[PDB]
Design a protein around this ligand. Structure first.
Ligand SMILES: [Cu+2]
Ligand SMILES: [Cu+2]
Ligand SMILES: [Cu+2]
Ligand SMILES: [Cu+2]
Length: 503
């Protein structure tokens, strides 16, 4: 296997606007097939990248900055990864960009059926506009952008269409958090790479039933190799001081459970939806697909050391000490450019619990599924298909509790568009009894969220055998959005539903 920690961590350049005034910032981003070397010892890999980069350029905006992005498809007319044509003439290559976490008007949110082919020659039934509008009227946070095209999301994302998008609120500057060169995104993606450098994505389950189409979707993808910022097991040279990292799980299926191999702590300062009310000292943390952790790592006491960012979470089996147990390596050998004037404050933001919204509605939602004519599992939210008439129809400006029941064997990272939400609690229940009768009998008391989940979230781990309750205020925009599992292999077949916020 590939030798760990021989390539420096790339830092994506920050995207420069095509036009910018006090009233408007305008960007252009073009999807291109490109080649890049993912490791010292590999031939260049063919990829799909925003502006021909993997990851795409980092976009930085201010809170309330009036931003437009023209996202363009200049990709080949044929894909290079295996398309399953049975899960959904139309063009083969359909794309649409979703700003994950964005408080975004519905026609700029990247609805799966708002796709477009090269040069917008053909467009999906929900397409309205070429140039997307992000007003950014929302808390400072780590967002990220990625492809969202119907039935192709797991492939277009795996091909390399992911990037970071950071909202900076000037009111947070007074906290003196590590900034500029000392504020670094870490986009983590697992990949399997062939000898010739080409990406491998499975054409079918291992030992495929002859009943299966070819290609066939698979219910989960676990990559043999871990990349950060588009390089296999990289190293980053850091100064002996405080750094802020924006950690983004941009993987299709894999969940990470991260730690430092010298026993050092992370200080979590933010979740999906922005700063936590209070910083949280952690030895380890779980990060499922699309979750973000905003953290400080303090390298002050570790000068000279090499520290491995390690992973303990299996993906289809236990971690391998030599491969997926490793993410990246910090080397604390960079000379100080200046005095560390950054801070690691305890008091960060107002508590979400300061809010006292009336509960308009309580929705009970089950995570389930069925079997198709080929014998494959089809994952379903509330036993509805994507194409079934809309059922999740919250009223604009109102707050609901969603009770998510998971009787399956695994965790699903549930994501809602537009909003961030509060976590209320989790409670274990009797799976057998629920499967046999539909009755919910609890086997233990409710567990309130840990400190890492006392702020705002948009993607939430719903564990097996538990009911998870969240509270969300649906606003400020009305329109047609989506909610779904963020395991992309589940999302595409068929664990995604429309969500109408009604006026
Ligand atoms: Cu997403
Ligand atoms: Cu999203
Ligand atoms: Cu799932
Ligand atoms: Cu989505």
């Amino acid at each position: 296997t590939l030798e760990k920690f021989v390539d420096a961590l790339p830092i994506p350049d920050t995207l420069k606007p095509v036009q910018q005034s006090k009233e408007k910032t305008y960007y252009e981003v073009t999807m291109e097939e490109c080649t890049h070397q993912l490791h010292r010892d590999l031939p260049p890999t063919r990829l799909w990248g925003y502006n021909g980069l993997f990851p795409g350029p980092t976009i930085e905006v201010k809170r309330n900055e009036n931003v437009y992005v023209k996202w363009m498809n200049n990709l080949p007319s044929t894909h290079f990864l295996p398309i399953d044509h049975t899960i959904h003439e139309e063009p083969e290559v359909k794309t649409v960009v979703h700003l994950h976490g964005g408080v975004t008007p519905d026609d700029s949110d990247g609805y799966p059926e708002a796709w477009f082919s090269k040069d917008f020659e053909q467009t999906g039934p929900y397409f309205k506009r070429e140039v997307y509008h992000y007003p950014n009227q929302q808390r400072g946070a780590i967002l990220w952008y990625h492809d969202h095209a119907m039935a192709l999301t797991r492939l277009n994302v795996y091909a390399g269409l992911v990037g970071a998008y950071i909202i900076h609120d000037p009111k947070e500057k007074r906290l003196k958090l590590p900034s500029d060169e000392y504020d670094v995104p870490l986009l983590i993606t697992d990949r399997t790479i062939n000898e010739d450098g080409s990406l491998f994505y499975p054409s079918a389950p291992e030992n495929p039933s002859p009943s299966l189409p070819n290609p066939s979707i698979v219910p989960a993808f676990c990559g043999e190799t871990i990349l950060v910022n588009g390089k296999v097991w990289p190293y980053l040279e850091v100064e002996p001081r405080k750094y802020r990292f924006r950690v983004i799980n941009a993987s299709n299926t894999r969940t990470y459970n991260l730690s430092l191999d010298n026993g050092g702590d992370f200080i979590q300062i933010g979740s999906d939806g922005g700063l936590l009310p209070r910083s949280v000292k952690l030895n380890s943390f779980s990060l499922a697909p699309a979750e973000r952790y905003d953290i400080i790592i303090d390298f002050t006491a570790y000068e000279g050391e090499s520290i491995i960012l390690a992973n303990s979470a299996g993906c289809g089996g236990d971690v391998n000490p030599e491969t997926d147990a490793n993410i990246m390596q910090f080397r604390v050998t960079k000379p100080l450019a200046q005095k560390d004037e950054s801070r690691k404050p305890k008091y960060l933001a107002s508590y979400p619990s300061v809010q006292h919204e009336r509960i308009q509605n309580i929705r009970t939602l089950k995570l389930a599924g069925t079997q198709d004519e080929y014998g494959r599992p089809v994952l379903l939210l509330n036993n509805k298909r994507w194409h079934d008439p809309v059922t999740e129809t919250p009223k604009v400006g109102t707050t609901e509790i969603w009770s998510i029941i998971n009787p399956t064997r695994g965790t699903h990272p549930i994501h809602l568009h537009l909003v961030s939400f509060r976590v209320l609690d989790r409670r274990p229940f009797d799976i057998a009894r629920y499967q046999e009768s539909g009755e919910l009998s609890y086997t233990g008391p409710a567990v309130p969220p840990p400190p890492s989940e006392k702020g705002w979230k948009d993607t939430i781990q719903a564990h097996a055998g538990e009911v998870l309750r969240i509270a969300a205020t649906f606003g400020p925009y009305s329109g047609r959005y989506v909610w779904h599992c963020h395991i992309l292999e589940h999302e595409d077949y068929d664990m995604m539903r429309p969500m109408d916020i009604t006026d």
